[PDB]
Amino acid sequence: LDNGLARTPTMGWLHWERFMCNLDCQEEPDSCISEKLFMEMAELMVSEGWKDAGYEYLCIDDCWMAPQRDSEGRLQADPQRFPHGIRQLANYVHSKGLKLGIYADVGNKTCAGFPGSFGYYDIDAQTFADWGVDLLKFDGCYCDSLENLADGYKHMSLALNRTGRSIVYSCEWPLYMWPFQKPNYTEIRQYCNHWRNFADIDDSWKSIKSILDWTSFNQERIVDVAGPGGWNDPDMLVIGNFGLSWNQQVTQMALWAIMAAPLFMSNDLRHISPQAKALLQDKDVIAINQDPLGKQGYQLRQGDNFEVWERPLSGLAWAVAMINRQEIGGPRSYTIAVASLGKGVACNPACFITQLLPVKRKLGFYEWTSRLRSHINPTGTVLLQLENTMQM
């Protein structure tokens, strides 16, 4: 999408994985989808360093809407859970230096069953702009035809443009195409700032593995489509939640950097461990994800329950991720000729290698003919940065 937005992958927070569609504010008040949840989350995004790290978009997902539109056919926030309204929430968010994302559906209803935007694309776009929305995640439930799907996605893209407000446009279009036909990613990129490709993430290592395995299996088809203005979206970061070991969290952070993924945390910033926070706020890894060249990485090698991924960065640098997929035993040794990394460019004539994950260690100068040896924890990843150099 050529709207001047998402020149690097969007960074923020999105409620869906951690909070889902909890409407029971009487018995689960700290988990329910309410304006107080988002206000507190914005406060912590400021005070706990998240905005400084680059997480800027505070995003509402499904289940914010009143069950029906108003008399003038406009969407309404829930009067009990969002009594002060989206525009006041947006003013509060903007006053913290943050941006506000919201959710709508291309079809007749949201996936949870709330008012869809079909037949109201222009109304809803102008409504969001009037409220001060800075991002829209557009879901694809309740759409009777792929023709209506594509028409609605393109139509909403155009309507958002017509508002004249800069609104990041996040689409689930490809994922809702897959059962019927393969997506044309050139068209999707024409209309969307990023697009969900695969099934919803959940709080499990199984989910991480399946997202990685489908990305790598399909990388011929999606890697080159991504770039400044339009990104592949492998779904939310779930670091800080319950189902990932420390090494599996390292793997998700490292590989979302490799994949040039949007970094949308879905966690509770009121209850997050220091380790998870330091991982999510890791400035070197964020800098890899946010690299200005904006070329998505890929799986370079796979075998013996190992994976090697790499990502080209600005200035002849490369990021290299080694994953140990053996889920038994201890750290396993992996050796590779540095000439095989970075298309043979990264270390020609030499490279300086810095390990960033799981811990930051300068490894030293590696000549083009040398070999790199590492040990990788079960289900963990070693993330390296290679900097091309003529020095020793």
Ligand X SMILES: *[C@@H]1O[C@H](CO)[C@@H](O[C@@H]2O[C@H](CO)[C@@H](O)[C@H](O)[C@H]2NC(C)=O)[C@H](O)[C@H]1NC(C)=O
Ligand Y SMILES: *[C@@H]1O[C@H](CO)[C@@H](O[C@@H]2O[C@H](CO)[C@@H](O[C@@H]3O[C@H](CO)[C@@H](O)[C@H](O[C@H]4O[C@H](CO)[C@@H](O)[C@H](O)[C@@H]4O)[C@@H]3O)[C@H](O)[C@H]2NC(C)=O)[C@H](O)[C@H]1NC(C)=O
Ligand Z SMILES: CNC[C@H]1N[C@H](CO)[C@H](O)[C@@H]1O
Binding site for ligand X (CB under 6 A): 107-108, 118, 143-145, 148, 184, 186-187, 190
Cα separation, 356 vs 359, in Å, equals 6
* Annotation marks residue 105 as catalytic: no
Could you tell me the smallest distance in angstroms from the CB atom of residue 329 to ligand Z? 12
Q: Which of ligand Y, a copy of itself, ligand NAG, none lies near 186, with the C-beta cut-off 5 to 8 A by kind?
A: ligand NAG
Angle CA 65–68–69, to nearest 5: 90
What kind and span of H or E run contains 231? strand 231-233
Is residue 26 part of the contact set for a copy of itself (CB under 8 A)?
no
- The item of ligand Y, a copy of itself, ligand X, none sharing an interface with residue 107, based on CB under 5 to 8 Å by kind, is ligand X
Nearer to ligand Z, 75 or 175 (CB): 175
Asked whether position 205 contacts a copy of itself by CB under 8 A, the answer is yes
Q: Which of 139, 235, 282, 291 is catalytic?
A: 139
Encoded tokens for 9: 């992958």
Give bridge partners of residue 383 from the DSSP assignment. 321, 357
Q: At 79, phi and psi to the nearest 5?
A: -70, -30
Is 139 tagged catalytic? Answer: yes
Residue 12's SS3 state is strand
CA distance 155 to 173: 13
Q: Which of 11, 13, 45, 61 binds ligand Z (CB under 6 A)?
A: 61
For ligand Y, the closer CB: 2 or 224? 2
* Count of residues in the chain: 392
Site for a copy of itself (CB under 8 A): which residue of 327, 343, 349, 369?
A: 327
Q: Which one of the listed residues 122, 130, 200, 203 is annotated catalytic?
A: 200
Give yes or no for residue 112 binding ligand Z (CB under 6 A). yes
Nearest one of 356, 353, 388 to 371, comparing CA atoms: 353
Which amino acid belongs to residue 184?
A: N
**Is the distance from CB of 306 to CB of 281 less than 8 angstroms?**
no
Which of ligand Y, ligand NAG, a copy of itself, none does 3 bind, CB closer than 5 to 8 A by kind? ligand Y
Q: Which stretch binds a copy of itself (CB under 8 A): 140-148, 155-163, 200-208, 295-303?
A: 200-208
Total residues binding ligand Z (CB under 6 A): 10
Return phi, psi of residue 375, to 5°: -125, 130
Closer to ligand Z by CB, 181 or 335: give it.
181
311-336 in b/e burial notation, b at 16+ Cβ within 10 A? Answer: bbbeebbbbbbbbbbeeeeeebebeb
Q: Which of 5, 20, 25, 336 binds a copy of itself (CB under 8 A)?
A: 20
Report which secondary-structure segment, H or E, holds 250. Answer: helix 246-258
> Minimum CB separation from ligand X for residue 116, in Å?
7
Q: What whole-number distance in Å separates Cα of residue 40 and Cα of residue 46? A: 10
Q: Report the DSSP beta bridge partners of residue 11.
A: 263
Q: Is 122 in the site for ligand Z (CB under 6 A)?
A: no
Give yes or no for a cis peptide into 378 (omega within 30° of 0). Answer: no
State which of positions 164-203 bind ligand Y (CB under 6 A): 164-166
Q: Is 78 a residue that touches ligand Z (CB under 6 A)?
A: no
The entry of ligand Y, a copy of itself, ligand X, none near residue 180 (CB within 5 to 8 angstroms by kind) is none
Tell whether the torsion through CA atoms of 257, 259, 263 and 269 is positive or negative. Answer: negative
DSSP string, 45-80: HHHTTHHHHT--EEE--SS-B-SS--TTS---B-TT
**Residue number with CB closer to ligand X (14 or 143):** 143
Q: Which residues are annotated as a binding site for substrate?
A: 172-176
Among 11, 104, 175, 382, binds ligand Z (CB under 6 A): 175
304 scored as a contact of a copy of itself (CB under 8 A): no
* By CB under 6 A, residue 303 contacts ligand Y: no
Q: Which of 187, 224, 304, 327 binds ligand NAG (CB under 6 A)?
A: 187
| Interface residues toward ligand Z, by CB under 6 A | 16, 61-62, 110-112, 139, 172, 175, 200
Active site residues: 139, 200
| Interface residues toward ligand Y, by CB under 6 A | 2-4, 7, 161, 164-166
